[PDB]
Design a protein around this ligand. Structure first.
Ligand SMILES: [Zn+2]
Ligand SMILES: [Zn+2]
Lengths: 120, 147, 183, 645, 65
DNA sequence: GATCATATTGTCCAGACAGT
DNA sequence: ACTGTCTGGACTGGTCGGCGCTATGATC
RNA sequence: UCUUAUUUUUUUUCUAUUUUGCGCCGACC
């Protein structure tokens, strides 16, 4: 349990976490010792910059588009979808097999060409 | 003949019983019978016409504390004077505690029990590897009945 | 799974940090206190971003330090059961392969890495398929979902993560591309 | 079972009174362990010369121990003075103790050679003038806690030890020289596998256990961690108490790890025949194993009182000494050459019926620390051999250029002012590294101190206490010359963490010999953590590294190893010091060494059993020996019985 | 020493058994029973279990090992 | 001689209670 | 409803200094 | 001149860093 109580909880994406870790790295560089963070945070930043598929503002726009498109999905589902960036039915199926809902091919397709917009 | 209980020091009930027997032999006491089972510790049974004879016979012995006021029914001590091996009533799969032997003060689980050789086979629960050992049937005590 | 939380907490500022700004001192204390640990209901506490609001301090008896009620932003990572994640294999040993997916290192069993008795090559730390003839090497991007998280300790390294990979649609990126080509 | 010990003792007494002069006054003749003890009233006429004692020992085939009868006994406060006057002052006697229950005097002295005698006549003269049977032990120049504890245990438990020895002597000589109907070898462990070795020699009269050990590698699985206790033969032997003796080839966890487990649950009550160095090193290793098992959080295998009981049930046998350990089985121990006190076990069954030679871990090339393995036996029929390096491609590099590379790496490290950290085992390669460093520093190559940390000092002290078990060169240096290689001033030992911190913070060059090759525990981890960021330092690995350990991780070239530091936060070790791997100091026999031992053994064994190694390596070694020499070779699995005769 | 007979379960100090006339003696025994009266109930219980025991006053036992 | 299980079961004030 | 009776609890704090005690009757 | 049984591959190191209690007596504030 972090703190006395939790006010807001959000499922943040990889790109925004990478931006936050870069800000922390800049703060540590401003800090006099040459080591900005510990092993776990530095390794997390390295993994995020290795898997930096989307820009933070593009990831935010995609997440808000997913949130406003449907109603049964949550922040976690949108974050996972923008992390994976699915292209066909296989990855969507292996993502949603253990989930509460096995989406139909039509909504899977609409998620697919919502995802592939401005996709690198 | 009524059965009464005489409390004695633990571990020397047989010596006190022998002393009472010698006193009865050499003092003309109206004592009918004396019993001292090995399983019962610290007490002996005396079959006598009345408790007064019991307290008179045990009087003068510093190792005999007192005589219990009640009278023991014969059905309670009937099973004591019965020919029955100590390994009887022990079934494999339960847990026992070894009273004596090289494994003194150890809990184990019964694997094989036979009454012809008056011995029992137990596996130590504290042993990481299961190695059965043999121990006399009267050296164990049942702690929990299970199959 | 990465998470952003807004947490209100009492922060203890020692008298040596009195000359500094209260927000900066609270941020420093929270960074030295909560960062680098594991929480049962929150996960890997990765970073403290900033402190939004702070309150007037209260001095408790027996301590000269000042306690402030402060709200701050925390970036954490929480592994979820049956959650898919992409990572990179960073360590390979015979009983299982270690992949980096974030602050933690997930473990993938050699038995359950594939539906094939894959042999471990000790010469170059490689995984070789007997029938599929697919080679797994270091630095290969993989995707797998988690099935077991050990939260028995508050230390990140002592926590154990086990994933599942034998299901179709998982494995190396080239394997996923080849599977998509068939479909 | 029936016992004819009384008749044998009566006939032995009759032979003695026929041969020994009547005026000697023979009162009692008894059996103590594998030896025959005779109590006399007039020792002056008993041992006027050693020829009579030698003839009695040859005729009776017993280790004759002539002691004065307890009826007459000089007072200890006067016996000490007569012993000090009689023993030359050159032999520094450190302790004198007296056992009056059975007349004995234990003399713990720095120079046992002068106390014992030129041909043993000094002991006879002492026990003639003072009427106290003497037993001389060596005072170690480096004090050892384990040896002192063992001596104190043996002294304070003289009654129990004497009763156990008497019962062992009664059990051994329950019958005369017996020809066994059949001889069988069974492997309860260590067959087609490494670790948890256990051998069973079975006859129709006696059963003998050999090097009962434990498997450290497979400790998570109880099935593979311990020797098979479900073997019907082992169950029968342990159940009916028919185990005559236990013999330990050498002091190691795979050969003596499970020994106190039998005494923990009172599964064994007989003797354990082993060399004194093997005994002390085995107790030290067992104590260490129990300590790390108790630290790791798992339940310890046995209590230290079980190790004490093992000490109380241990009989010391020197090299080349033949003792009767079973009515049909004689036991002797030869120099294996693997570690200190490592013994090749030669079991002679029957009167020429069969001979088994269990080598165990051994080395055939002449090393600096120990003499080469004994390849000559009076008779040999079955040879049980290790196969740790039995593979075709298993070729260890020679020792000369390996030690040259180690010396030059150390010299280059000390030239730039760095520190040398050498993780090593508790025994074996560590003392070899110490000897190589001492030889290098004796000519003036290096004057830097050498720090021994983490129980290596205890092993060094045990090595000093038994110099006769070392190599010929070290024996020549210690005995004939006045220079002890282990007593060099460069070798230093720490006292606490303060001295270790002072060594780490010291800017002068130094050599540190650690305690754990894997850097799993001991001061090795602390030294690695505090010396890794310095690039001038270096680390030398003299042993194999196991996967998943810190040693293998730092050997594989990892420049940043994340470990669990204090406060539950991951701290990285930035390894900038040089990493070296010189694995040429292994004490195990090479494949070429095994082939040379097979070719040069005398006499040629009828059959060879390849054990103590991986299954493929054992099969390869057996096939190679069969194809090269034609000897029948077998590599059986566990729970396999081979009928030798 | 102290020994108990195996047939009549009598406890005697010397080698001879003066009650049953048998030549089997056991050094290990428990459950000492003292008989002073013929008609006493525990003597009758001994008689029905061991037909050759509790015939004369003295010492007896139920089981001998 | 050296060990070993057992070793017994002054006054005053206030609250609760049978008795009449 | 009264009245004498049985039972239970507490009896100022602190300090200096000393004296003395904390096994034994069977068993091999 | 006849019934009712089955059958096969994925977990690692030879070991380690300042005597209480009980009770008595006396004295002082
Ligand atoms: Zn070995
Ligand atoms: Zn009889």
């Amino acid at each position: 349990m972090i703190g006395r109580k939790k006010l807001e909880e959000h499922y943040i994406t990889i790109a925004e976490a990478k931006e936050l870790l870069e800000r922390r790295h800049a703060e540590g560089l401003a800090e006099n010792p040459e080591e900005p963070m510990f092993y776990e945070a530095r390794v997390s930043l390295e993994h995020a910059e290795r898997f930096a598929k989307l820009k933070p503002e593009q990831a935010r726009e995609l997440k808000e588009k997913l949130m406003g498109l449907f109603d049964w999905i949550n922040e976690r589902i949108a974050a996972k979808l923008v992390d994976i960036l699915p292209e066909d039915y296989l990855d969507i199926r292996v993502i949603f097999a253990k989930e509460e809902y096995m989406p139909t091919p039509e909504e899977a397709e609409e998620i697919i060409k919502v995802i592939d917009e401005y996709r690198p | 003949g009524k059965i009464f209980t005489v409390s004695v020091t633990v571990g020397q009930e047989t010596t006190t019983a022998n002393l009472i027997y010698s006193k009865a032999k050499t003092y003309n006491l109206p004592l009918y019978a004396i019993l001292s089972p090995s399983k019962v510790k610290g007490y002996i049974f005396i079959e006598a016409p009345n408790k007064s004879a019991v307290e008179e016979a045990i009087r003068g012995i510093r190792h005999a504390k007192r005589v219990l006021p009640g009278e023991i029914p014969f059905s309670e001590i009937e099973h004591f004077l019965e020919e029955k091996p100590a390994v009887s009533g022990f079934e494999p799969g339960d847990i026992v505690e070894l009273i004596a032997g090289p494994f003194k003060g150890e809990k184990a689980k019964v694997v094989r029990v036979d009454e012809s050789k008056d011995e029992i086979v137990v596996e130590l629960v504290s042993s990481v590897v299961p190695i059965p050992v043999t121990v006399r049937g009267e050296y164990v005590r049942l702690i929990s009945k299970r199959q | 799974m990465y998470k952003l939380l807004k947490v209100k907490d009492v922060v203890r500022i020692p008298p040596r940090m009195f000359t500094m700004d209260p927000k900066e001192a609270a941020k420093i204390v929270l960074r030295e206190t909560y960062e680098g640990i594991y929480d049962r209901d929150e996960g890997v506490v990765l970073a403290i971003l900033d402190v939004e609001e702070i309150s007037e301090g209260v001095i408790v008896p027996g301590d000269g330090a000042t306690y402030h009620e402060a709200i701050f932003n925390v970036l954490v990572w929480e592994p979820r059961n049956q959650e898919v994640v992409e990572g990179e294999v960073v360590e390979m040993m015979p009983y299982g392969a270690f992949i980096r997916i974030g602050p933690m290192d997930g473990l993938v069993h050699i038995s359950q890495l594939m539906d094939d008795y894959v042999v471990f090559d000790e010469k170059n730390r490689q995984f070789i398929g007997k029938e599929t003839n697919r080679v797994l090497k270091l630095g290969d991007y993989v995707r797998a979902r988690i099935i077991g998280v050990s939260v028995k300790s508050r230390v990140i390294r002592e926590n154990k993560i086990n994933m599942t990979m034998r299901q179709p649609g998982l494995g190396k990126f080239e394997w996923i591309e080849k599977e998509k080509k068939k479909a | 079972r029936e016992t004819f010990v009384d008749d044998i003792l009566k006939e032995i007494r009759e032979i003695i009174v026929q041969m020994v002069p009547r005026e000697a006054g023979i009162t009692d003749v008894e059996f103590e362990g594998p030896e025959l003890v005779i109590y006399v009233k007039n020792p002056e006429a008993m041992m006027k010369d050693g020829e009579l004692i030698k003839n009695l020992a040859k005729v009776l085939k017993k280790r004759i121990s002539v002691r004065p009868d307890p009826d007459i006994l000089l007072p200890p406060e006067k016996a000490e003075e007569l012993i000090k006057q009689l023993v030359p002052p050159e032999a520094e006697i450190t302790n004198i103790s007296f056992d009056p229950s059975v007349g004995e005097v234990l003399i713990e002295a720095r120079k046992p050679g002068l106390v014992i005698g030129k041909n043993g006549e000094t002991l006879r003269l002492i026990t003639q003038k003072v009427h106290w049977a003497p037993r001389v032990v060596r005072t170690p120049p480096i004090q050892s806690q384990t040896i002192y504890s063992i001596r104190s245990i043996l002294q304070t438990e003289s009654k129990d030890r004497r009763k156990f020895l008497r019962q062992v002597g009664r059990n051994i000589y329950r019958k005369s020289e017996y020809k066994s109907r059949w001889i069988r070898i069974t492997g309860l462990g260590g067959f087609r596998e490494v670790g948890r070795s256990a051998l069973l020699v079975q006859t129709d009269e006696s059963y003998v256990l050999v090097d009962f050990g434990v498997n450290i590698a497979a400790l998570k699985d109880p099935t593979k961690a311990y020797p098979h206790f479900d073997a019907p033969e082992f169950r029968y032997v342990l159940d009916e108490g028919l185990l005559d003796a236990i013999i330990i080839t050498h002091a190691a966890l795979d050969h003596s790890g499970m020994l106190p487990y039998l005494f923990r649950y009172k599964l064994f009550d007989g003797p354990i025949y082993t060399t004194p160095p093997t005994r002390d090193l085995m107790t030290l290793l067992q104590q260490d194993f129990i300590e790390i098992q108790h630290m790791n959080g798992v339940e310890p295998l046995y209590r230290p009182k079980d190790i004490k009981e093992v000490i109380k049930h241990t009989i010391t046998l020197d090299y080349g000494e033949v003792r009767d350990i079973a009515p049909d089985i004689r036991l002797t121990l030869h120099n294996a050459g693997h570690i200190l006190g490592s013994s090749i076990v030669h079991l002679h069954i029957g009167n020429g019926l069969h001979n088994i030679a269990i080598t165990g871990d051994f080395k055939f090339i002449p090393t600096r620390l120990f003499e080469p393995a004994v390849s000559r036996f009076p008779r040999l029929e079955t040879l049980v051999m290790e196969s740790t390096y039995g593979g075709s491609n298993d070729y260890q590099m020679p020792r000369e250029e390996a030690e040259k590379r180690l010396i030059e790496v150390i010299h280059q490290t000390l030239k730039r002012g760095g520190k040398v950290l050498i993780p090593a085992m508790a025994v074996g390669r560590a003392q070899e590294i110490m000897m190589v460093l001492e030889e290098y520093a004796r000519v003036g190559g290096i004057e830097v101190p050498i720090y021994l940390d983490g129980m290596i000092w205890e092993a060094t002290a045990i090595h000093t206490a038994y110099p006769e078990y070392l190599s010929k060169h070290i024996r020549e240096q210690i005995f004939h010359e006045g220079y002890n290689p282990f007593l060099n001033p460069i070798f230093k030992s720490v006292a606490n963490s303060r001295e270790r911190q002072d060594i780490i913070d010291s800017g002068e060059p130094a050599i540190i010999i650690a305690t754990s090759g894997m850097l799993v525990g001991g001061p090795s981890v602390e030294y690695f953590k505090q010396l890794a960021p310095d690039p001038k330092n270096s680390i030398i690995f003299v042993s194999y590294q196991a996967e998943g350990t810190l040693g293998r991780q730092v050997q594989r070239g990892l420049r940043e190893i994340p470990i669990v530091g204090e406060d539950g936060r991951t701290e990285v070790i930035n390894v900038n010091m040089e990493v070296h791997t010189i694995d040429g100091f292994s004490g195990a026999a090479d494949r070429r060494e095994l082939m040379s031992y097979v070719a040069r053994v005398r006499p040629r064994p009828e059959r060879i059993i390849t054990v103590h190694g991986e299954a493929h390596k054992c099969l390869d070694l057996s096939s190679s020996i069969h194809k090269k020499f034609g000897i029948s070779t077998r590599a059986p699995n566990n729970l396999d019985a081979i009928r030798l005769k | 020493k102290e020994r108990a007979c195996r047939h009549c379960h009598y406890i005697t100090t010397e080698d001879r058994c003066p009650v049953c006339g048998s030549r089997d003696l056991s050094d290990d025994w428990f459950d000492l029973v003292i008989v002073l009266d013929v008609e006493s109930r525990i003597a009758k219980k001994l008689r029905e279990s061991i037909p050759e025991a509790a015939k004369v006053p003295g010492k007896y036992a139920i089981r001998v090992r």
